[PDB]
Symmetry: D2
Subunit: 293 residues, 4 copies
Amino acid sequence: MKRKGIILAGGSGTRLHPATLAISKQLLPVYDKPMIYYPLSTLMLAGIREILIISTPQDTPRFQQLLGDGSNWGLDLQYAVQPSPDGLAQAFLIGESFIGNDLSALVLGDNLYYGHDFHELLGSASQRQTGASVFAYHVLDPERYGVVEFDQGGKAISLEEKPLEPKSNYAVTGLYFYDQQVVDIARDLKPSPRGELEITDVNRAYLERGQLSVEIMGRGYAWLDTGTHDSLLEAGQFIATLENRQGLKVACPEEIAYRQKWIDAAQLEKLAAPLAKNGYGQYLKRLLTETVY
Amino acid sequence: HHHHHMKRKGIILAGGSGTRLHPATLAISKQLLPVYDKPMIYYPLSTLMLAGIREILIISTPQDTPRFQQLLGDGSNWGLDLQYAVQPSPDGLAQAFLIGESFIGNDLSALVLGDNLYYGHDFHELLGSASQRQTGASVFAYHVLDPERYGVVEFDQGGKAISLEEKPLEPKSNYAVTGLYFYDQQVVDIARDLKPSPRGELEITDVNRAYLERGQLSVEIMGRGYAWLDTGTHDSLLEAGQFIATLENRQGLKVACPEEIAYRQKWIDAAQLEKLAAPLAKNGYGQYLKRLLTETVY
Amino acid sequence: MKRKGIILAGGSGTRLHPATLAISKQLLPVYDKPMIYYPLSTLMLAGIREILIISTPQDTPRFQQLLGDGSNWGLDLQYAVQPSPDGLAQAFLIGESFIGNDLSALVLGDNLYYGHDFHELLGSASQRQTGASVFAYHVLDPERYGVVEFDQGGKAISLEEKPLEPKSNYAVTGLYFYDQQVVDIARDLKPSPRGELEITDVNRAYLERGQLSVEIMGRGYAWLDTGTHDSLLEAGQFIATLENRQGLKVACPEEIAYRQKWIDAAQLEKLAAPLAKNGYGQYLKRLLTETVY
Amino acid sequence: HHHHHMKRKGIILAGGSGTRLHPATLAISKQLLPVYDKPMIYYPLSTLMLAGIREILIISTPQDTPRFQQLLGDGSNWGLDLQYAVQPSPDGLAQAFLIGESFIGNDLSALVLGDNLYYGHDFHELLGSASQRQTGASVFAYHVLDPERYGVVEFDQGGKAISLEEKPLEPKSNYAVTGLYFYDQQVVDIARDLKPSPRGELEITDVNRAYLERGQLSVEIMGRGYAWLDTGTHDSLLEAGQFIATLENRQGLKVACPEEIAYRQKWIDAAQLEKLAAPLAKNGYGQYLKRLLTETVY
Ligand SMILES: CN(c1c(N)n(Cc2cccc(Br)c2)c(=O)[nH]c1=O)S(=O)(=O)c1ccccc1
Ligand SMILES: CN(c1c(N)n(Cc2cccc(Br)c2)c(=O)[nH]c1=O)S(=O)(=O)c1ccccc1
Ligand SMILES: CN(c1c(N)n(Cc2cccc(Br)c2)c(=O)[nH]c1=O)S(=O)(=O)c1ccccc1
Ligand SMILES: CN(c1c(N)n(Cc2cccc(Br)c2)c(=O)[nH]c1=O)S(=O)(=O)c1ccccc1
Ligand SMILES: [Cl-]
Ligand SMILES: [Cl-]
Ligand SMILES: [Cl-]
Ligand SMILES: [Cl-]
């Protein structure tokens, strides 16, 4: 079966104002590229080419202007709007017609991942034709997230959204893989006490039926925090340190399309031309003649 | 016949950065990118406010003017009056005086680059000296590692500025001209007579050289105890953010908070500052504005 | 066969003076722990418990004072001196009696690694009873390192030390696994034109006999640069960002010993006592009651 | 009978940090850790040199005194005279005056913490005012986020300092006393009469309060345009390193280069500075010392 992707790049309220007064958090850069390149690249690494970008009404033209229809990168991009930030599970209602009868994956527009064999980690989750897959990651501050509790055998037995007394330090990350049941589960959700349609309620519905795979994303992966001005700075410095050490980019969509064979050398060469005078286009030109393992 | 019985107006040039920082700047102008906790343009705006300037023209691209207007409005909230103009093509810094000719009128002026960040002690007093000069031009020179990127000032043995060179391959000194410029009423006429350089730009260094040739350029040293932060590259932008974060988290005080500067200048009163804090009350920025109302800061 | 480890933590000349005037680079911290904890942890992750620490004559008492005989961490540590910085291959002459008839691994005392399944990456190299194994890593500045050239099939065909015209961007990292032949190869080395016994000559001797395994260390791993004041800062910020995000430490030797079962819960509890009032001892105490996957 | 016909001596307290930063500090004292490109102790040493102080006592643990001596020697290379003393047990900051009693003799003094870093414009002049006071004590107050970690100064409505509290749970202000202290000849006698606090330390705040009670404490504000960098935690040490790196790489000038300060004070001449550059000539620090010989820096 085909798997379609959704990037939810909705409003971060007023929490980062005045920095985000003028423009959505996900159109701002982490080091050298727009924040949205990172979760987009995550979906591309999972082999997903048909992708819905959900943003605020005000910033959808900007996401559209930035990414186009995706055909330059061998993708098929569509756009939709989330009028009010009334919960992550709204993605599946907004995206119901887009998803149709296919499998799906949701990624949050402000989620950054780095590490070895992430392609294989996503490949495994994407291969499951039934059930849902999520990733749990050990964090200092689990109370900010959906929290997973495990029994002594290591089986996931409960999920709580932003608990006052977290049962573990394992947070659910902002990457979710779903089968054909998710739209119908989302359509039956009721708003929580904080007035949102909760993705954790979606995940708990799968858990109750024994159909939730909780994979550990180990400590050798970085799931970088973009929630505060402080953590934003850290993410930028993290990406800068890797890129300047390696001479290789993290989450370059043009590169990922080229390595997936979704575009050819001639198309990559055309994409390198507009930015030929700066580091990004120079990088793209170098991809045409260097073997990188 | 004219009658006498002067005001200084400000201009912020915030016209993006072409393709130099793409793809980071594909969706939005460089000068709306945050430096740590606030939009880049807050920093040079705060610099003009610290110079006592209340009437300011923001020059930006046609595409992003509405975003600057959304952010800053007409300035009345901060005791300012802000006007807006567009720069359809990036034809050089000195074009600010042609675009802003009607805005300037017969007044003195100051131009600041929308990506210039300054920090340090007695900066208010450093600006005061330049602002109080009613004739000629005033610029600031700062020692940098890479003067070849800038307008460079050469000094004689007595410390007098004797030449200015734009991006010399072999700089005569390490003293770069910073992106803050004070001018008298001669500047619009000087700017009108400029020809484009080989790189296709109306050059601010040519304006400054015109004042130098008339013996009316003051070059003040901005000493090494001030920070003039680099926003030219993705690397330097990260450094700028880290620098501001380090200071603010150490001190519990903000750098370039326009609400604060307006309040300290008595351009807005306590009642007004309280109203500005209300929308941001659930975040650290609003809580800071609230703390300002009761705390004495020296 | 048993595999023994060597950490070469010798002099970095005058290149980082005056910062390193008073004390060796490898006794200074990267964020929250002495630099030497990082390569030590790397050897421990490879399952190596018997380890020789080689330092300058002046700083050996300090390494000795810091780490002891290793019995507190379930290790067997020994110490030796490198009087002059006359090449990395001197490790095998200095360490000849220590190595005896066993397999060996050498790590540089200023080499920091991070990433997922690094234990498995080292396990594979450590399992080889014959030949040598090294890791190649794509870098911006290969001219600083031993550089590997590959043919079109991806086979390593040459190695050059600090070439003026590097044949690729793949640098050999500072972790080397050797069979029982390395001492004898090292004993036959002649000094290079720069007056050093070159580890690259050791590696080329294995390459010539078709006995060098060059594994790619992929871009999902971080091999952090400690060669300059600038890169030192970056390494610290990199480790800080991971540790403060996760609430888990990178290269905590006490933790690695505890997870290898080289020390028990009662021994870890004793190790947590001296530093109980600071973050490091608090971390160690938390390890006794938390399951980390 | 004594005869009259004053000199100020300096003390740097560099006695480690107990176990607080272990295991990072197991092998070496905190004050020998680099901040970016130079040992931590260069920063407060440079601060005393900027105050015009040439005769300085370094107090350290018995274990690390040889390392400080290896680094700094007798000071003659930099136009200083350095002496050394040991602090066998960490019994409080004010113990510096008992350990250093013979060193101080009948002179004025200044005490700086070996982990205190300062940066900013006219810092030389800020120190000058304090140094020139021949009687009483002078300290500096700085606005911080976390005054509960420090000696805290309370001010009346006229801006006069009226109380000092060590680590108050409910601070009266956000003004912390920095780790730089200027004293007259009364300090050794004040220090001799101190009793240990509940935490088992001879407290500098008690010394300062004694001067306050005699009406002889000057509290000068170190304004928000100066950086007083935090070295208390692993996090803050990284921030300090990043802050210095950002300034030095922007300016092509160093912060707290003792060779430079000695040269600018005319305590060493060009010939001597050339000799100091020779050992470090293949690295950036030696190349910097060389550049100093030909370049005019304002
Ligand atoms: C660093 N990573 C990475 C690669 N590894 N590869 C190589 C690569 C490997 C496998 C398949 C493809 Br297509 C491409 C790449 O071309 N671009 C990459 O950015 S990643 O898998 O950790 C990742 C990327 C984006 C967002 C989150 C994680
Ligand atoms: C840190 N500085 C500063 C202050 N010093 N004051 C206090 C202050 C002092 C004097 C006059 C006024 Br109004 C307000 C303040 O309210 N806000 C400030 O940000 S500054 O002079 O380095 C500066 C600010 C913006 C851009 C460039 C430099
Ligand atoms: C982050 N890493 C790591 C772990 N992964 N584990 C868990 C762990 C996994 C497998 C075996 C053991 Br023992 C312990 C751990 O206990 N401590 C660790 O630091 S690492 O493998 O990338 C690494 C450590 C030191 C130096 C270089 C790399
Ligand atoms: C950056 N500063 C500085 C200088 N300003 N000068 C120039 C200079 C100016 C005035 C007198 C002398 Br001597 C030397 C210098 O040669 N070295 C300097 O580091 S400082 O005043 O913020 C300072 C230094 C060390 C520790 C704390 C603060
Ligand atoms: Cl892992
Ligand atoms: Cl200065
Ligand atoms: Cl990889
Ligand atoms: Cl100030």
